[PDB]
Paper text:
In this study, we present the structure of the SP gp8 in complex with the dodecameric portal in the P22 procapsid at subnanometer resolution.
Three column-like structures, each interacting with two neighboring nodules, were observed on the GOF nodules. On each GOF, each column connecting two neighboring nodules consisted of a three-helix bundle. These three SP subunits interacted through the three-helix bundle, forming an SP trimer. Each trimer interacts with two neighboring portal subunits.
Residue numbers in the entry:
A (entry chain C): 68 to 245
B (entry chain B): 70 to 245
C (entry chain A): 71 to 245
The structure:
Amino acid sequence: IERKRQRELEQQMEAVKRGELPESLRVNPDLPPQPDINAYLSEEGLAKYDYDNSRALAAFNAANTEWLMKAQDARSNAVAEQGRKTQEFTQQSAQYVEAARKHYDAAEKLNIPDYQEKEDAFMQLVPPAVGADIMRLFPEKSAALMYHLGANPEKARQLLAMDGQSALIELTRLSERL
Amino acid sequence: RKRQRELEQQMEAVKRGELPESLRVNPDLPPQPDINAYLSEEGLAKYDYDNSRALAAFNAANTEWLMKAQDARSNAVAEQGRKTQEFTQQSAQYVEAARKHYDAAEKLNIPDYQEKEDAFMQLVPPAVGADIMRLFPEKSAALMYHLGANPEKARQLLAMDGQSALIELTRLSERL
Amino acid sequence: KRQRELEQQMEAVKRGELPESLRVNPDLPPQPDINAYLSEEGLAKYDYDNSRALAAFNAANTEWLMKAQDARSNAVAEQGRKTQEFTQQSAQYVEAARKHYDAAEKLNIPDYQEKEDAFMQLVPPAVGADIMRLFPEKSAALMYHLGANPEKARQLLAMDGQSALIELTRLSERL
């Protein structure tokens, strides 16, 4: 039951392990415009340069070069940037897979699967990112308080109105409770 | 005892830095037909014999080639970093293997396993010995002790493939 | 005391403070020009055919970007190689340093200090470290005898440094 959403997670991590990364993951380069050929090869430009192709193209070269060296510098910057992001999402995907696996193990030991569906419905209510936080920090910080979190949704939002680290402190203390 | 000291010496030599070449990832560069073929009969035919459509065609082709080639080799570099940190993890794991294996080797209360390990080195390459002491070093000492006792089983395991030979080594550890 | 600043400069290297000498510039071959080919003479080579000319344009841009990135990758590989190499030979220089020392204070000479100053003035720390690298067991002793023979030392310093090391080995065998 609850392991099905773990399988959805397995598909998002499959998008990473297979290399079939999401389109939004990839980042396009930001480049200065290519110099305009017709800005100089216009017949009006030819009259400017006495109907000579060679002289129009000297300016054309100036314009074009710098653009291509900037292109290669931006390509190096882009390989660095996008490789960094792909790596980081790789570690995030891993941490998610083992964290979710352990969390669903704990929920299975909790042996109340019919509560896990409403639990996760509450998570896609407004804590998707908070669910990711649960996964990354420690997936099972409060077992019976997870039931209560299902139970406490409003005062759940009350608790979530306050920031992440202090919320971690509150979750640790309520774990000391449950 | 000295085999330990050389093992770590080599291995913190590994940690403070050096890298082999295996981690390199070949970038992916997608080929593509050129604008000469695009103004050719086939290219113009697929663009309905329009030169301006071919102009848009090669401009889009360059832009998308930038897009996809960039994504390809940047993912290749990301995987290169992945395998580099994997190499770091393997180095740390082999450190643990060396330390615990040559710490537990003396717990047998006997020194005669040294020549048995030397016989294992002769029969079986030291790289495979490092691998096996990495996998499970708790019975490794008795493992090459008995292997030096019976080199015939060492040869018969060397004949067979590495993974199934490892499985049989695990069985030999078990029925001890 | 020279040993102490030997180590401080050694780990000064070890914090990545590599000299500019280790910065190796990758070679970028000249960029192809669109204007060598879409101009009057280039299209004359191309018989005024813009299709082939702009095809050469595209191919040149693609291959130039590819060779630029290849040069970058080669620069990365070689810079890593040189960095690791120089770290290693730094390790052997500091080796020669402290084995030279511990051997020297193992020996029971009365007048170590001033002769050590004189030769460290005469030979750079790297040169001395290489001296111990080639001859480690009694580099101190070759320094002692050279102080007992700095004249030749002079002839020596006058003559080739590598050949100076050759003559140092010669006299070390001679004693």
